[PDB]
Amino acid sequence: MSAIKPDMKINLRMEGNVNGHHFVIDGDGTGKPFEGKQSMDLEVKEGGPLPFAFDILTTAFNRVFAEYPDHIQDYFKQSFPKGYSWERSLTFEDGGICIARNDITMEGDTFYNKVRFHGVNFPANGPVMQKKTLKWEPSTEKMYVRDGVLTGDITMALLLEGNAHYRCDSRTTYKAKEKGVKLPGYHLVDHCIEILSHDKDYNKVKLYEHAVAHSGLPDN
Amino acid sequence: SAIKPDMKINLRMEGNVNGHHFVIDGDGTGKPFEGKQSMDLEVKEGGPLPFAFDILTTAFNRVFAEYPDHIQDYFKQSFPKGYSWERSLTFEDGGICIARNDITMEGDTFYNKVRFHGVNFPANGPVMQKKTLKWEPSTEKMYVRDGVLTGDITMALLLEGNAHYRCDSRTTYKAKEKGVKLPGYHLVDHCIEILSHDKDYNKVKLYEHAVAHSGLPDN
Amino acid sequence: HHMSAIKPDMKINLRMEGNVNGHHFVIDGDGTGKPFEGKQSMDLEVKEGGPLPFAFDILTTAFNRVFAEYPDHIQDYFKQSFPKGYSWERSLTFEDGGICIARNDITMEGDTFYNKVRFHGVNFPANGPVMQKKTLKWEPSTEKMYVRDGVLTGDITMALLLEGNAHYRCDSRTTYKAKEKGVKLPGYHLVDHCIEILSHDKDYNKVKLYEHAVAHSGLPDN
Amino acid sequence: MSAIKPDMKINLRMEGNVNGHHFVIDGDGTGKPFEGKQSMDLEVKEGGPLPFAFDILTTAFNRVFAEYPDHIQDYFKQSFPKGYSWERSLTFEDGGICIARNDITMEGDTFYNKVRFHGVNFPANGPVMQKKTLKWEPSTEKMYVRDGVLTGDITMALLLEGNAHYRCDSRTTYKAKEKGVKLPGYHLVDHCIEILSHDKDYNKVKLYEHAVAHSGLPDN
Ligand SMILES: O=S([O-])[O-]
């Protein structure tokens, strides 16, 4: 009833502004929604080289690519073909704050992603502006309903040079476009996002993501 | 030098709160040295706004604050070239807004390019339900962090029914010209009010009064 | 690096003294567990301050990461911290302003872990779910373990299930410190947790608690 | 007739534990409730010399001593002779968290303060454990009612050696012991606290505080 196919293309356009620097990044990728895997090639079309760590944008670069077991309601796959949208806040431990949105629509075998990303108050000597990030660590999103809306909260951490970490708290709210899509119960979503390759200045990046929903111990 | 006793304000805000895009124009006047400014606002697009207009109002210029002679006035020292600010508002129910302003001057007019984005406001909360009455008067705590003037504020919106809605504000302020000397720690008292509005806030008259001081016992 | 003297089956002796919103209480615990299976359980008895005027659940995460199953590719700080032991301190920040801090000093004698627990909580609203006892249980969660300023630290996004099927969020931060020199710090990893009140009397003066915890490295290898 | 006299004495005993270090501090002071001023001599009875910055304890060492104007209800002066108590959390930007409680009663011309202070999760290399604090900057408490209880929130900042600042957010709830003390409307309370003198290791400290409530601008 979704018309979500086992192999899907992804078409993404993101425009943003972090600390006054405007950028536009295009993505073209492919994914396996039922396998919870996606990858994409990204190109900074405007505003490169980015004066800040590319990693902070990468979670903005679609929970339709999360493997859901049968015992958990899969709000995202049930949201199609009309699609859904999300809004997120990323609160970093040094006061940097970003918000992002994405409206996901599907035409055929392609998801289209309209992504906006704005960040403010990153310290000049912090690891984001000084590009000291190495990767996001694997994380687990906590998904619950609040005020009739599916919401995901995650304790996230960017690995830095020296193997220090930089903490970020994210909150995302997810909203099906079509009315009456059934909200899931509380669950967890394991995430692992990775930049597989990049040019020296991150004007081109290959990004990979793997996400699996589960109900926690003892069952997972 | 740059800043005259009476001064005009031209503002354009583009925003998106909870996915609703809007554009608001502002034409105003103030007295920088008395720390008072007033502005007429017209929602040019996205009207009527589906959310509390009050959340936008602190984004609608610290050059309009009365600084006393004993405290360095970074804002007036930033002109003619001007300065910019970036702000996050973290509301107690998870709603978060970020805003930027780039302020420039030509002649007797300040030009404000304002952007405002808000996400994650709950549908039955006072913001989406428009249950706000006003920002309470507040005090900004101004300090330097990582070489940047920063202002933090414990803010509270009065709601219908006499409850309050808490927000924490952090603003960073940056002069465009290199070498503007940063102030030491100080406070800025703020009072913002909507003086009038039409029923759906497509037109609003806004007024703000701000005074910088060094706290007790000398304030 | 050395023999821990941690046996596959251990006893637990716990004494907690605390104050939440001005109400003092003392709670004693006797339990047993399997450190290598990451499972433990204990019978708790409120020794005074009973019956508690707040939700018992907020105390439960304070009632030992030595009971967590670690795979051998993740360094297990807690088991190596024995025989001498370790201590932790923790803050719980609840979404409505309630804030708790808690400390445990853990030692081992023979086949028994001894836990000296303190718990202090302030600013919970009178009509909030903690003070009105509207909580059902903690949801399963995942702690993110990492080294922060040279100290092993775990941060958790937690949520209490309430009556009416709402959730009440809490953020926890715990610092863990071995008592002896030479304990190797682990790299970033995750710890799945699930805690549950198995049974209780009407006023929670008596409670049976169980916990299961498993360490892992996240996707793709978990 | 009034329980609040123009010249009052203060008797205080604090017991605390910060980062596992236990301590007991006794305080003997005087103040002028109507002028919003008080001072106290403190002596560390147990656990001295303290291994952390004494300044973090100082706001725990009574809003009875705040000058309130006629047009703002003075909850604190109206709470006596029976008294009131407060509970507070101090959330420092580097993860240190302190909670404190004070139960204040009165006998004759003396206030009795039973204070408890606990802190956890201060980093070894941070300004509290390294004793790099110089003072609390002057601040303004925002006072409002929430769920029937008078609550005060403050954006606070410790000046550090080197002219940096260390941020702390505090929230305090205040509750009269008598039923029927009328809650105030929203208002502000300016505070300044200062250590007037101390011995090298802070085993003896003289502390002073001045507080004035007001309605904000325009008025004052
Ligand atoms: O993991 S549960 O069964 O406590």
Side-chain angles (χ1 to χ4, degrees), chain D residues 7-8 33 50 66 68 73 78 80 88 90 95 100 121 147 164 166 169 176 179 185 192 195 197 199 206:
Chain D
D7 281 87
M8 302 214 44
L50 303 169
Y68 267 76
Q73 154 78 347
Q78 292 294 314
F80 286 93
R88 176 178 300 159
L90 303 180
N121 289 347
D147 210 10
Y166 177 44
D169 294 320
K179 259 189 228 71
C192 60
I195 289 182
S197 61
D199 70 338
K206 177 178 305 191

Coordinates of all heavy atoms in Angstrom, one line a residue, chain D residues 7-8 33 50 66 68 73 78 80 88 90 95 100 121 147 164 166 169 176 179 185 192 195 197 199 206 209, unseen atoms left out:
Chain D
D7 N 16.8 45.0 62.6 CA 18.1 44.5 62.7 C 18.1 43.1 63.2 O 17.6 42.8 64.3 CB 19.0 45.4 63.6 CG 19.5 46.6 63.0 OD1 18.7 47.7 63.0 OD2 20.6 46.6 62.4
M8 N 18.5 42.1 62.3 CA 18.3 40.7 62.7 C 19.6 40.0 62.7 O 20.6 40.4 62.1 CB 17.2 40.1 61.8 CG 15.9 40.9 61.9 SD 14.4 40.0 61.9 CE 14.7 38.5 62.8
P33 N 16.7 43.5 57.0 CA 15.7 42.9 56.1 C 15.1 44.0 55.2 O 14.9 43.8 54.0 CB 14.7 42.3 57.0 CG 15.4 42.0 58.3 CD 16.5 43.0 58.4
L50 N 38.6 23.2 51.9 CA 37.8 22.6 50.8 C 38.6 22.5 49.5 O 39.3 23.4 49.2 CB 36.6 23.5 50.6 CG 35.6 23.8 51.8 CD1 34.7 24.9 51.4 CD2 34.9 22.5 52.1
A66 N 15.8 41.3 51.2 CA 15.8 41.8 49.9 C 14.9 43.1 50.2 O 13.9 43.0 50.9 CB 15.2 40.9 48.9
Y68 N 12.0 45.1 49.3 CA 10.8 45.1 48.4 C 10.1 46.4 48.4 O 9.8 46.9 49.5 CB 9.9 44.0 48.8 CG 10.1 42.7 48.1 CD1 11.2 41.8 48.5 CD2 9.2 42.2 47.1 CE1 11.4 40.6 47.8 CE2 9.5 41.0 46.5 CZ 10.6 40.2 46.8 OH 10.8 39.0 46.2
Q73 N 4.3 42.3 46.2 CA 4.1 41.5 47.4 C 5.4 40.9 47.9 O 6.2 40.4 47.1 CB 3.1 40.4 47.1 CG 3.2 39.2 48.1 CD 2.5 39.5 49.5 OE1 2.2 40.6 49.8 NE2 2.4 38.4 50.3
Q78 N 6.3 38.1 54.6 CA 5.0 37.6 55.1 C 5.0 36.1 55.6 O 4.0 35.7 56.1 CB 4.0 37.8 54.0 CG 3.6 39.2 53.6 CD 2.9 39.9 54.8 OE1 2.0 39.3 55.4 NE2 3.4 41.1 55.2
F80 N 6.9 34.9 57.9 CA 7.4 34.8 59.2 C 6.3 35.3 60.2 O 5.4 36.1 59.8 CB 8.7 35.6 59.4 CG 9.8 34.9 58.8 CD1 10.2 35.1 57.5 CD2 10.5 33.9 59.5 CE1 11.3 34.4 56.9 CE2 11.5 33.1 59.0 CZ 11.9 33.4 57.7
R88 N 17.0 24.4 45.6 CA 17.6 25.1 44.4 C 18.5 24.2 43.6 O 19.0 23.2 44.2 CB 18.5 26.2 45.0 CG 19.3 27.0 43.9 CD 20.1 28.1 44.5 NE 19.2 29.0 45.1 CZ 19.5 29.9 46.1 NH1 20.8 30.1 46.5 NH2 18.6 30.6 46.6
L90 N 21.7 24.3 40.8 CA 22.7 25.1 40.1 C 23.3 24.2 38.9 O 23.8 23.2 39.2 CB 23.8 25.5 41.0 CG 23.6 26.3 42.3 CD1 24.9 26.6 43.0 CD2 22.9 27.5 41.9
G95 N 28.8 20.8 33.2 CA 28.2 19.5 33.7 C 28.1 19.4 35.2 O 27.5 18.5 35.7
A100 N 20.6 22.3 46.4 CA 20.7 22.8 47.8 C 19.3 23.1 48.3 O 18.3 23.2 47.6 CB 21.5 24.1 47.8
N121 N 29.8 15.8 39.6 CA 30.1 15.8 38.1 C 30.9 17.1 37.8 O 30.8 17.5 36.6 CB 28.8 15.6 37.3 CG 28.3 14.2 37.3 OD1 29.0 13.3 37.8 ND2 27.1 13.9 36.8
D147 N 3.0 26.3 39.0 CA 2.2 25.2 39.8 C 2.1 25.6 41.3 O 2.5 24.8 42.2 CB 2.9 23.8 39.6 CG 1.9 22.7 39.7 OD1 0.7 23.0 39.7 OD2 2.4 21.5 39.7
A164 N 37.8 35.3 32.1 CA 36.7 34.5 31.4 C 35.5 34.4 32.4 O 35.6 34.8 33.6 CB 37.2 33.2 31.0
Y166 N 32.2 31.7 33.7 CA 31.8 30.3 33.8 C 30.3 30.4 34.1 O 29.9 31.0 35.1 CB 32.6 29.7 35.0 CG 32.2 28.3 35.3 CD1 32.1 27.3 34.3 CD2 32.1 27.9 36.6 CE1 31.8 26.0 34.7 CE2 31.8 26.6 37.0 CZ 31.7 25.6 36.0 OH 31.4 24.4 36.4
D169 N 23.2 28.1 35.5 CA 21.8 28.5 35.6 C 21.2 28.1 36.9 O 21.3 26.9 37.2 CB 21.0 27.9 34.4 CG 21.4 28.4 33.0 OD1 21.7 29.7 32.9 OD2 21.5 27.6 32.1
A176 N 6.5 29.1 51.6 CA 6.2 29.4 53.0 C 5.7 28.2 53.8 O 5.0 27.4 53.2 CB 5.0 30.5 53.0
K179 N 0.1 28.0 55.6 CA -0.9 28.1 54.5 C -1.4 29.5 54.4 O -1.4 30.2 55.4 CB -2.1 27.1 54.7 CG -2.0 25.8 54.0 CD -3.3 25.0 54.1 CE -3.0 23.5 54.4 NZ -2.6 23.3 55.8
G185 N 3.1 38.7 42.2 CA 3.1 38.7 40.8 C 4.6 38.6 40.3 O 5.5 38.6 41.1
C192 N 23.6 41.1 44.5 CA 25.1 41.1 44.4 C 25.6 40.4 45.6 O 25.1 40.7 46.7 CB 25.6 42.5 44.3 SG 25.2 43.5 45.6
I195 N 32.5 38.0 48.6 CA 33.3 37.5 49.7 C 34.1 38.7 50.1 O 34.9 39.2 49.3 CB 34.2 36.4 49.3 CG1 33.3 35.1 49.0 CG2 35.3 36.1 50.3 CD1 34.2 33.8 48.6
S197 N 36.2 39.0 52.7 CA 37.6 38.6 53.2 C 37.6 37.1 53.4 O 36.6 36.5 53.6 CB 38.0 39.3 54.4 OG 37.1 39.0 55.5
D199 N 40.6 33.7 54.8 CA 42.0 33.2 55.0 C 42.4 32.4 53.8 O 41.6 32.0 53.0 CB 42.0 32.4 56.3 CG 41.3 31.1 56.1 OD1 40.4 30.9 55.2 OD2 41.6 30.1 56.9
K206 N 34.2 35.9 55.1 CA 33.1 36.8 55.4 C 32.4 37.1 54.1 O 33.1 37.4 53.1 CB 33.7 38.1 56.0 CG 32.7 39.2 56.3 CD 33.3 40.4 56.9 CE 34.1 40.1 58.2 NZ 34.5 41.3 58.9
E209 N 25.8 40.2 51.1 CA 24.8 40.1 50.0 C 23.9 41.3 50.1 O 23.5 41.7 51.2 CB 24.1 38.8 50.1 CG 23.7 38.2 48.8

